[PDB]
Amino acid sequence: ILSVDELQNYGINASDLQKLKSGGIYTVNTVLSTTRRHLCKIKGLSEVKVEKIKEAAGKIIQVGFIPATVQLDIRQRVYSLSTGSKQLDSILGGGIMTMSITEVFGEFRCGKTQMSHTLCVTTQLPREMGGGEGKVAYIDTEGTFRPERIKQIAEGYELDPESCLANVSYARALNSEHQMELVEQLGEELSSGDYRLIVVDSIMANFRVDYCGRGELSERQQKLNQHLFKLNRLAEEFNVAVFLTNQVQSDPGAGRKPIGGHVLAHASATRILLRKGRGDERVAKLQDSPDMPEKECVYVIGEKGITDSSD
Amino acid sequence: ILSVDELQNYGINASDLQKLKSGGIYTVNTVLSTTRRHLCKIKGLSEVKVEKIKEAAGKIIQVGFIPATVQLDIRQRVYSLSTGSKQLDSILGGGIMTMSITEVFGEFRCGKTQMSHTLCVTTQLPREMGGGEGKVAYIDTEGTFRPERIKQIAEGYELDPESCLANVSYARALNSEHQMELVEQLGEELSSGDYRLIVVDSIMANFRVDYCGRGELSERQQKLNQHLFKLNRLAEEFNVAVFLTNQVQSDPGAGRKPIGGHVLAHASATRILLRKGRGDERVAKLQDSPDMPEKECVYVIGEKGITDSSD
Amino acid sequence: ILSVDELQNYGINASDLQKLKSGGIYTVNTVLSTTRRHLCKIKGLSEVKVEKIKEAAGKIIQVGFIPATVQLDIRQRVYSLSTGSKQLDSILGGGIMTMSITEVFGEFRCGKTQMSHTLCVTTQLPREMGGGEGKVAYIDTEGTFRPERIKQIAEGYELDPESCLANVSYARALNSEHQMELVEQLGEELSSGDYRLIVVDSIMANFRVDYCGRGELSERQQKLNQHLFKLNRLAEEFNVAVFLTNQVQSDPGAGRKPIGGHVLAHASATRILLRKGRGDERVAKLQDSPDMPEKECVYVIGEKGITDSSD
Amino acid sequence: ILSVDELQNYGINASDLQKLKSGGIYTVNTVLSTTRRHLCKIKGLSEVKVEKIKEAAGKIIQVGFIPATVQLDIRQRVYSLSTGSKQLDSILGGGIMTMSITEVFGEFRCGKTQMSHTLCVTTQLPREMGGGEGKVAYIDTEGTFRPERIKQIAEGYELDPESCLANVSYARALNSEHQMELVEQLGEELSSGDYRLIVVDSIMANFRVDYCGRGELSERQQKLNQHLFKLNRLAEEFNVAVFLTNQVQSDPGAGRKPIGGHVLAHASATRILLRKGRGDERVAKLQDSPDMPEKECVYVIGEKGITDSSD
Amino acid sequence: ILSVDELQNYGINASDLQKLKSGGIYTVNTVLSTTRRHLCKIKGLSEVKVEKIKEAAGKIIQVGFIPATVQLDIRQRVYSLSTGSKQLDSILGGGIMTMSITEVFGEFRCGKTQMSHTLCVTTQLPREMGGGEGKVAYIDTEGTFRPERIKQIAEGYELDPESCLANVSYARALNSEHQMELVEQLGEELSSGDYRLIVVDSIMANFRVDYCGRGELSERQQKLNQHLFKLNRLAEEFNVAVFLTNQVQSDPGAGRKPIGGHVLAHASATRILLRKGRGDERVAKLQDSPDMPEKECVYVIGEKGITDSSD
Amino acid sequence: ILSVDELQNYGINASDLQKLKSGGIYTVNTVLSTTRRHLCKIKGLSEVKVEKIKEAAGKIIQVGFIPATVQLDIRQRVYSLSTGSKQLDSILGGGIMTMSITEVFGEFRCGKTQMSHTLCVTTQLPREMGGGEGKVAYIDTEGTFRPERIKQIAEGYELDPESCLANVSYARALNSEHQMELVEQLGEELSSGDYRLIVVDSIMANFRVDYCGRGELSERQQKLNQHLFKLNRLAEEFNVAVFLTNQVQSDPGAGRKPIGGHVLAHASATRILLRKGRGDERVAKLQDSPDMPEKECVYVIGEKGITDSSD
DNA sequence: TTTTTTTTTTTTTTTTTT
Ligand SMILES: Nc1ncnc2c1ncn2[C@@H]1O[C@H](COP(=O)(O)OP(=O)(O)OP(=O)(O)O)[C@@H](O)[C@H]1O
Ligand SMILES: Nc1ncnc2c1ncn2[C@@H]1O[C@H](COP(=O)(O)OP(=O)(O)OP(=O)(O)O)[C@@H](O)[C@H]1O
Ligand SMILES: Nc1ncnc2c1ncn2[C@@H]1O[C@H](COP(=O)(O)OP(=O)(O)OP(=O)(O)O)[C@@H](O)[C@H]1O
Ligand SMILES: Nc1ncnc2c1ncn2[C@@H]1O[C@H](COP(=O)(O)OP(=O)(O)OP(=O)(O)O)[C@@H](O)[C@H]1O
Ligand SMILES: Nc1ncnc2c1ncn2[C@@H]1O[C@H](COP(=O)(O)OP(=O)(O)OP(=O)(O)O)[C@@H](O)[C@H]1O
Ligand SMILES: [Mg+2]
Ligand SMILES: [Mg+2]
Ligand SMILES: [Mg+2]
Ligand SMILES: [Mg+2]
Ligand SMILES: [Mg+2]
Ligand SMILES: [Mg+2]
Ligand SMILES: [Mg+2]
Ligand SMILES: [Mg+2]
Ligand SMILES: [Mg+2]
Fold first, then answer.
1. Could you say which residues bind ssDNA here (chains A, B, C, D, E, F)?
2. How far apart are CA C196 and CA E53, in angstroms?
3. Please, are residues F159 and F124 in contact by the beta-carbon 8 Å criterion?
4. What share of chain A is helix, strand, coil (3-state, %, to 5)?
């Protein structure tokens, strides 16, 4: 993590830097990621300044073709966050993977929110125990965040519940526009490097309501795509994992069919389908993954959150 | 509760404030919750004006990421409204929870309407007695609201009947559009802060009839989702509990199956299934709950409404 | 009761009224209850015309939240129609209550049609005698309406026989579609305000035949639900009582099981189950009631219709 | 009776009339009674054609609410067909009544078939002598029709036997599907208006065999219900009396229990139970009657068929 | 492959070569393909110099009309890169073809990224094994490149894993402008002649986000068209195969519709539609090819990457 | 065809002949068509020399008003080249006519390249077989020229494949300037008189990329107009048919819309729109034809190239 | 003269038999 202040010594005045920090650009990588057309929109920034900044940023970090062997070593930094269920972790290859977007969808009571709360605790577990040992950023759109539940789970893992709660940042996304604003501003908070997980529950809850009908569909997906693109951009640059929960819908024309359309399906690197099972058992199926094959596992929602049926 | 009049001092034209109030926005929080798009649709509100309003509202209340510990403290201000049955309260964690949507569905004569009447009285009980000590807003779609029943229950709890009735606001939702309108204008009435409960009995009664067939299914669910979203928005802002009763349907393709589809299931934070039992006993099962595990309890419908079998 | 003509002086075109009256909308209340989407269907009615009408209706009658105490006073206008059996009336709370749907189902020869004939006479009895002192609208689907029977009952009550017949309107529903059409056009007849009771005998007789099989089950219930919804609306506006007789069915999978499914069970506010007893005695049990507890009584079918065993 | 040909005057082309006549719709009343969705089922009939047919029929016959006094005069045309036993006639109110379905069930040798043959002769007797002076349509499923028996009875009543036989239309129902078809095409023969009685002997004999087991029980009743619906339907338009004989079954779980279930019990307007008596005497009990009280009478089977014990 | 240094001896000073080399012109062919107007844009390059360069370039390589027979001989240099599925290769005529742009589009989890990973291995296979025996350039826009997956596939083909990775160059396209910049300077790397394949996954991912709305649609396609044109230019000049993956979209107005519009469809020589099949089977349909007819094949995603269903 | 050597006899200096040939002038008709300003533009050409050359050319060929009968007799020399589809040839009036420019546009995979390849073979067929029996000049801008496809089509038509290929001249148009140069020096090759067809596929591919934005739109259209004018001049002079393939674009503001604008629309004498049809069927519609009325035909793309659906 | 975009949403019980 290199702060935009690093640009200052290369020859950029501090006055511009605040404009960059004003526009939500607190890291050098975010400078390279942002397009020149977008930087120009930043207030107090001219095309001459934008070009100057971009040239300076390249002087610090070089981006270009590199041998896949080198990209393998960089890939070593990725964390695998335990979901609390060893069977579910096995199919996922270790759990939720950082630097990528993971999505879970299914009917109600299927454990989507419960899994999010479990990740809030396990994420704080030290590496080699399924966790990344870092803070968690929680974005609530359903309104079901329960701090007591995290404390109860933390006790199951034998962690100080007060300490675990402190390492979780909670934001309530009142509407889609607010939800997008929260994500765009995560750059400053994440720049510290403490965070490891970003949870959006649920991704499409607000978008479903704000944009209604055929006419709004085109604008809805375009806004959602930019929202997803930013989330994916955040995950890669800060090495944090993005966990998204999604609803489902019934298809009268024709597992359950998720919502969000193709824009969400393409953006999500990993998608898991959660179904109700006999009694309290749940069935998780890995619909889409970049590195793991399709499989199913059985998990149970218990005191410790998501855990193995026997566990 | 901050009235929109607060924006007046920050520089909002008094004429505009009326438009907001005419637009059903009587609180500062409702301003932050409402999207900039929706505000523009308000008559006499220009896109330029909305910027000042939203910026002014932000000046008063700051919304952003906060430590989970702080959100835990804010969580303390939630009430738990006794359902009249101690056993049913135990599985629910204390009763119906404010800031969340609770839905009870089941076959006929299972006590859905009876439970709603019980909550009308218990809600008026002082806190530490299972109630919230506040007014109740009752929205009737079945047409079975019975003021005499509330009086009979109030005597069972040793409360003044006529005084108990005065604290209940009853609205008869003739059709789905009217039902949607009533919820929108609850902002003004709730702004006083006296109300503690909102009862919709039942949620899908009107939506079932207005939108008939698969052709109108998409429109029906879209309207219902916005209706449910507004109800959830009201509950969080005013710290009121939303209690919904729902019908059930027989599934020839395959506890009873509820109606409303996945839109209602996702929106509802808590769902209780009520079944007929031996004699006058009923069985309640907690299908979905953000914080409590699945459980079953037996309750009875007596003079005091919903009560324990022994009681 | 306010006719739609009252809408005219508020600014409604006289020509539009015929279109409204043509659509079976003869009262102001029916205007408010009817949704805008349905009004747009009416011939020669444009959305602007539909819009203008709605506010005009609003200017005449105000619909919104009101204190429960006020609703209690409105509830005072309810009528309780004697069923002829004092013991049966006691459990019912006084008899059949207007503004609610009452459904009696049971085996053959259980008196379902006998009560319908009894209600035809008692309804004409002046209030304080168990009646409503009003006309009766009788819709027949069984085909067992017997004007001679009503004359015999009337002589039992020392009422003028021919006078009693005059105040009864008889309609024979040939099929489900004709049955629904009769109900929709009751608005003009009920607008006079004389009618107190509406009798459908039996509700599901036609719906059973017209829609046969799994494929037509979904359409049958949807059509039935709209039919029941309209009946419930008629009772509320015109303060009439809706009395429904229903058939029963045997349940090989597992008191008799009624037909009509959950749609009928939810719609009906009160449901009485009639069984055969020793000799000519019958047993009536109150399965579902919004305001009275479960009870059983014994009644007899005699010269004066439904009567108490001793009576 | 008005033939569908009258529909020609109001604008129905002769081509369509044949299509209706193809579907067995030979009367104006049958057009009104038949549902629109059923008419569209007719081959070569479009919804527009079906629509045009209905209002054209409406212009001829008006169906709607009418004073019960008027319905009393229409009811005045009913016929009471002597059963041959004066005591049995008295309890029934005069004998079998047209426009209603009469069912007699009991053990073997109880006179069910003998009564059917007696009705064949008596029906031809002129009114004021117990008969309706009209033809008799006989449907046989037992296969026990005995034309020589009718001739013997006719001699007892002192009327011409061969002329008596000529006025009887006999059909042998080979299977349930054939039996249902015969009823549907009774409209053609009945349209003449000569017929007064319809005999089905026995109603459930064929249905019992064709649909065997609980698997087909649901389909059997649905088919039987539609079959009974038309029989009741046919009686009303043509003012003919439908006489049904039914078998009985022993009930190990627990007068004899009839077969056919509730579907037959509800549809049957009148039901008489026949039991064996001392010697050749028989006992008849009126289980269900829309207009007469329960009673028992003793009758004998003699040369003239069903006759009074002393007679 | 002729380097621009070859141009120097014809009379071009080394200093100018640096400017053209700086402008991404590293081969003699690139000089001829590049327009004079474009060369004038290069710094330190005057029109006189451009004319001198272009005339000198013609002195080395002459471009003009040639007999189709000669063109056939040159066409022999084309490679066919196996996609791993013999059935898929058969319809394609041998696999992916160099000197042309191949685009595979389809719904998520359809193997688009899997094919790209598979092509990374097979491309290193020696000729007559389905590969080109050359390096691979990988451009990532979704961010799903997985070096581990390449190693696992390499073992399936019995190739040294680390050796296969060393021969793959990976570049991460942060945004559309960066993606275009990578391609423009990609000429230098390809100049060595080792590379045989170029993978863009996905082509339209960035362009979708950077340019939003009808207002920016015109600019988006123009930039995309220039991007595709350069890719096509690279493939022909260096005899490398360009493999592109594309997303799909739902068409509410009316096989899945791809994104990118007509600009992408025209530019792509070969287009394959990947569709989900029963279980693990996928269906590949050849929508557009210059030399092969439409066909469909079934392939599976296994440990060895894309493989035949039985394979 | 008359070469400039004919001019030399009348008194034209040989050096002037070499200069004019260097200026792309090899025929008397080219001398007459070229304006005196353009001729003076040629290096080493003086105004006196240009005047002398023009006067000598006029002395060889005289251009002036002639009777329409003579023009019809000359028009008799025109050929009609079969497109492979009998219906398409019929609608076109016999196929592609020489001395005119023909353009086909449509979506991808609509057979534009396939149609050009089919023409490449059919042109070699002798007269009365639909061909012109002459060499074909092919200019490629897409890059999809396929000698193998030409060989396969020739075998389908029963022609020697290598002989057919030898008679096809192929030029690859790297950029718009190169394409214009190739067209300019087509004159010398066409001087031989062997060629009958000139194919540009596609016309606007290079112009779309070289000139971008409304800023350069005017220059792009001017260059395209000069290009099309030169092509038409060549077609008229050498009695060859010019076949052009064009892309299409979507029109958000508002059969597909072609590109190239009014310049291309006016320049093209004939324009055929190709659309996708059910299965392998394609639909060709004659948008603009100087001599034939609008029509539609159906063709299929098979082994023999463009062929009729049944064939 | 130029340039396409983007999916949504479940419903409804029947019926004795010996
Ligand atoms: N005042 C009362 N005293 C006693 N019992 C009552 C009273 N009011 C209602 N009940 C009982 O409550 C039941 C009424 O059904 P209720 O409305 O509670 O069920 P529900 O689950 O809401 O079903 P539905 O939605 O179909 O009405 C009956 O069992 C009735 O006896
Ligand atoms: N006018 C009358 N005088 C005396 N008793 C009568 C009279 N009308 C009917 N009854 C008696 O009352 C009963 C009639 O029952 P009713 O017709 O109400 O049955 P139901 O259960 O409604 O029938 P269904 O099976 O058609 O629904 C019979 O037992 C009959 O003897
Ligand atoms: N000609 C006759 N004279 C007198 N009695 C007769 C005559 N024919 C038949 N019977 C009597 O009438 C009855 C005829 O049996 P019937 O066909 O009526 O039986 P059921 O009860 O209708 O039906 P099933 O026997 O098939 O169950 C017997 O009791 C028989 O003795
Ligand atoms: N390494 C792997 N091992 C096994 N199966 C895998 C592997 N990688 C992916 N899969 C399977 O292949 C599918 C995903 O393929 P892929 O990622 O190519 O999809 P895609 O259609 O390209 O995705 P997108 O929607 O992002 O464009 C899933 O069913 C997944 O289980
Ligand atoms: N030998 C062949 N026989 C038949 N069809 C073929 C053959 N080779 C290729 N095709 C078909 O040719 C089609 C492509 O047609 P073509 O490229 O001419 O279209 P177009 O209208 O020029 O569109 P675009 O300019 O966008 O490529 C593909 O659908 C492919 O299946
Ligand atoms: Mg949740
Ligand atoms: Mg994906
Ligand atoms: Mg209720
Ligand atoms: Mg939920
Ligand atoms: Mg018999
Ligand atoms: Mg009956
Ligand atoms: Mg992918
Ligand atoms: Mg193409
Ligand atoms: Mg092409």
1. 208, 211, 214, 220, 282
2. 103
3. yes
4. 45, 20, 35
Nucleotide nearest to F224 (CA to C1'): G1
Domain ranges, ordered by start, for chain F: 1-72, 73-308
Q: Distance between CA C148 and CA A247 in Å, rounded? A: 62
Entry resolution in angstroms?
Answer: 2.9
DSSP letter for C126, please: P
Amino acid in position B123? T
Cα–Cα distances in angstroms (integers) from residue F256 to residues C262, F15, F104, F247, F274, in the given order:
54, 52, 12, 9, 9
Round to whole Å and give the CA distance between C21 and C39: 12
Q: What does the block give as tokens for C272?
A: 């009485």
- Beta-bridged to residue E301, according to DSSP, are E306
Q: Is the minimum distance from the CB of F225 to strand G below 7 Å?
A: no
Contact F242, F230 (CB under 8 A): no
The CA R_g of chain C, rounded to the nearest whole Å, is: 20
Q: List the single residue in A169, A178, A210 with the smallest CB-CB distance to B66.
A: A169
Q: Could you give the angle at the alpha carbon of A51 between the alpha carbons of A47 and A53, nearest 5°? A: 115
Q: Is the CB of B41 under 6 A from ligand 1?
A: no
Residue E24 burial by CB count (10 A; 0-12/13-18/19+): exposed, middle or buried? middle
For ligand 3, atom 11: residue with the closest CA: D301
Q: Which residue of A has its CA nearest to B263?
A: A249
Residue B214, token pair as written in the block: 């698969």
Radius of gyration for the alpha carbons in chain B, expressed in angstroms and rounded: 20
What is the Cα–Cα distance from F82 to F89, expressed in whole angstroms?
6
Show the tokens assigned to E229.
Answer: 């044109």
Instruction: With beta carbons less than 8 A apart as the criterion, state whether F148 and E73 touch.
Output: no
The nt closest to F266 (CA vs C1′) is: G1
Tell me the two tokens of residue D176.
């349930």
Helix (H, G, I), strand (E, B) or coil at A74: helix
SS3 D230: helix
* Chain C positions in Cβ-Cβ contact with residue D216 (cut-off 8 Å): none
Give counts: helices (H), strands (E), chain B.
Answer: 15, 14
F112 phi, psi to nearest 5 deg: -60, -55
Question: Which ranges in chain F belong to alpha helices (H)?
Answer: 4-10, 14-22, 28-33, 36-41, 47-60, 68-75, 86-92, 112-122, 147-156, 161-166, 176-191, 205-210, 217-238, 261-267
Find and list the nucleotides of strand G having atoms within 7 Å of a protein beta carbon. Answer: 1-18
Q: β-strand B80-81 against B96-97: which pairing, if any?
A: antiparallel
Helix, strand, coil: what percent of chain C each, to 5? 40, 20, 35
Show the 3-state SS of B206-262. Answer: HHHHHCCCCCCHHHHHHHHHHHHHHHHHHHHHHCCEEEEEECEECCCCCCCEECCHH
The approach used to solve this structure was cryo-EM
Q: How far is A258 from chain E (nearest CA, A)?
A: 13
> Which of C213, C168, C200 lies closest to C268, judged by CA?
C200
Phi/psi at B83 (5° precision): -85, 0
F249 CB closer than 7 A to any strand G atom: yes
Chain A residues 142-171, Cβ below 7 A from strand G? none
How many residues make up chain B in this entry? 311
Q: Three-state SS for C122?
A: helix
Rounded Cα distance, E25 and E17, in Å: 9
The 3-state DSSP composition of chain F as helix, strand, coil percent (nearest 5) reads 45, 20, 35
Burial code (b: 16+ CB inside 10 Å, e: under 16) for A104-137 equals: bbbbbbbbbbbbbbbbbbbbbbeeeebbbebbbb
| Helix-strand-coil split of chain D, %, nearest 5 | 45, 20, 35
Q: Which secondary structure element, helix H or strand E, spans residue A105, and what is its range?
A: strand A101-106
The finding on whether B109 has its CB within 6 A of some atom of ligand 1 is: yes
